[PDB]
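Hi there. Long-time user, first ticket. I'm pasting a complex I've been working with (about 815 residues overall). I'd like to know whether the download I got is complete or cut off, because the file seemed smaller than I expected. Thanks.
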Amino acid sequence: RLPAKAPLA
Amino acid sequence: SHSLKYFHTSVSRPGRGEPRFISVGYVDDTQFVRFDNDAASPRMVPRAPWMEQEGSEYWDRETRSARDTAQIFRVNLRTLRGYYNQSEAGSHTLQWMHGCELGPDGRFLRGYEQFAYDGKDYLTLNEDLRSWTAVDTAAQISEQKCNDASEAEHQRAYLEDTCVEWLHKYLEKGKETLLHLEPPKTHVTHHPISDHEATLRCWALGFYPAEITLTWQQDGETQDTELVETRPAGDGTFQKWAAVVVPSGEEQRYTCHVQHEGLPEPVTLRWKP
Amino acid sequence: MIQRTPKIQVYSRHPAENGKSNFLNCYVSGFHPSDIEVDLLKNGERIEKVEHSDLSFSKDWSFYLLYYTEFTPTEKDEYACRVNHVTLSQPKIVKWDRDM
Amino acid sequence: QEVTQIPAALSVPEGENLVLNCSFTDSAIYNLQWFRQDPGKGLTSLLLIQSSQREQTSGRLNASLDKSSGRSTLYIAASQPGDSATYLCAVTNQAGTALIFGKGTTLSVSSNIQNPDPAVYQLRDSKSSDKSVCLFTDFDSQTNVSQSKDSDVYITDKCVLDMRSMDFKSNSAVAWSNKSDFACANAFN
Amino acid sequence: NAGVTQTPKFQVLKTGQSMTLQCSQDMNHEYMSWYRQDPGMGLRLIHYSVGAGITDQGEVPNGYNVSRSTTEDFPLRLLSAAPSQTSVYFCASSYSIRGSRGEQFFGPGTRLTVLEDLKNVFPPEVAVFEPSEAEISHTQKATLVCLATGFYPDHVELSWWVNGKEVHSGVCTDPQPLKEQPALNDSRYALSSRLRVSATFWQDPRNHFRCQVQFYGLSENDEWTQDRAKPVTQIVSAEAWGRA
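Hi, the file is complete. Here it is re-exported in full:
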């Protein structure tokens, strides 16, 4: 399954 | 030595709306889910037979997760564009690769995340999963940013706990296909290329997983091997050939050596006329 | 910006024998950026039954796609894969060899 | 994500310490934020605790964060009447793109009435009219004003007013009607 | 700098009417949010934005649209006003959601009331009541009482004006309005406020006292053909002088 948060660069 | 990995791709298309966004999920070397935002009300969908029995609660969650990632990656494409002093006219490619690996014991072994901008290593997560290595000086601003927000914290929690838990769930749900070791059906083909030279091509067909080692040796002791990239047969299995240019008449001097998880002992082939 | 050219393989799923149903595959890999046009051709004419695998990529961030269609190879008929990419100044065609 | 604030309403005498609580289902948050809302006004941020941080102190306010437990505690040391307001709790949602809020804890810090002198007075209208209104005032802060049952007879809830000029606080409640058989003496029973 | 500005502060709508709630910030904040607040439900995220041209829906987005054409502006559009959308709407912005600089700033808020019939809208009648002889005698303090009666909806701001200047001290207005007919669901409201003051100051006949109620009713756009003066947004004031 996918992680809930995507890192912001 | 299993793994659950995802491959995210965002492509800025300025003046033609929001960027293109595609996610694909892999267990070992088997794609099981996919998201494509290039559609009206786009959704995460099953792409393995063994994934269709999951409830709509799963797909609704995966949909929202993939939707929010697309939205974040749109912002990221804006930010990175700003860092490299690039035009708002060009198309730019942000790629995100994350996954967890299980050890022999079947417990968490290791996690990794990496970013790439325009096909080039940008920002790698360290093996401690608590900090980043900005591969470029432009990614230093990003590194400082992801540390201020404790971004690695949430990725560690996913990679160590959530990722490992669901990898186990998938390996059970798809066990009949995922845990099956299909060994390569292997043979040798002779292709004359000139008067003096011929080509011995060592085949490996319908093997799974994708990991395989093909090498040519000579009785006594060779030319540098041509090794084609491992390709999908389109049925869940893989194909690969290794080719070697040899002097014609001297073909039965060369042996092919195959190594695969599905082979108890390494197989040796030799071309018979 | 660093742009890599598509590596093109055209091949059947199973060892082809004339007048037996098989699957024609065109594997395009090692290319950047993602945007690519791929058609499978019977006798130089475009095939409209064509499906393709979802966009993924390798350790070096280079994209790969599997284009494929169900087909019955014969003696007379010729199959190829036409691929156009920003790296190619001219659409590139690769004939299906049974021995590659 | 769901954020719960326990209790919903709190009433404490002035000078006393009090805890406002806030718990959240999802521990994977970036920031927790406490806010103040005065009636008919917007929200003003009081304290911001990062996921990495544990304490944040602002005068008589100390907020604490236990990511594991999934709760924050706002300690209000030696409460004053000026604290009487609504306090809301908020964490970063699953996506991490906006704040999700709790119902909030409606706080009432009752003023200490030095010398209570409970009295009911009658007031005539400035524009004649034979219009009369009852005023219950100078009563102790602990007593709650019983609402009138009688139809078309109206009684307000109490409010405290500050006469800084004379250093004097006094509670106050009002009652009135359009009837003729309406006396102020035994109107607040 | 003004922080976050919202317009209007009060608005009355008929069911089916559309309108745009204006919100702007001059702080260059990339993140902006719209919430609604109704008793015992708390702040419910309607819509949110993470930058110019990027919008998404929250907990309860149905009935509303948003646009983030510019970093500066985040308008909220009610397409077809319904009674259920009667609430208080707050616009909010912040430099960051995930970063250390995550202080979120809110607007002064918009009170919205949607009605089937604008007929049921009346303005407040205000009357000031002079202090009790007994109070001056017993305490040597004088409590004036302001009473605003028979207004709808709950869209009023009561204040006191001693010698033509707004007093912020010696006052308390009731925290809640009061239902004149608790039986009815459309019932008009009643509000009371106390101004206490030294007996000496009340006794001085040069002291001017006035309680005023700013009522926010209908705009000049709103249609009105009822046999009655249109209940427009207006100030209604009662007053009294000092006396020995």
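A couple of notes from our side: The first strand of chain D starts at residue 3 and ends at 4. The interface with chain B takes residues 28, 30, 50-52, 94-97 of chain D (CB under 8 Å).
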